[PDB]
């Protein structure tokens, strides 16, 4: 369930994880416009937005 930023994200929204574009990051939840996404470079786990990462394709 792995994907990829599309954009420079900045964590705005409280428990929110930061990533880069093109980043990567293990979706653990995708309940809801907000992911819960688990880094992998870093690992950081946190909210991110559904519409932000696209499939590592």
């Known amino acids: 369930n792995l994907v990829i930023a599309l954009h420079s994200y900045e964590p705005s929204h409280d428990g929110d994880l930061g990533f880069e574009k093109g980043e990567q990051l293990r979706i653990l939840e995708q309940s809801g416009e907000w992911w819960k996404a688990q ?19």
């Not at 880094?39 to 394709?57: D, H, R």
Request: glycine share 10%.
């Open 39 to 57: 880094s992998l470079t870093t690992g950081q786990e946190g909210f991110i937005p559904f519409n932000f990462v696209a499939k590592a394709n």
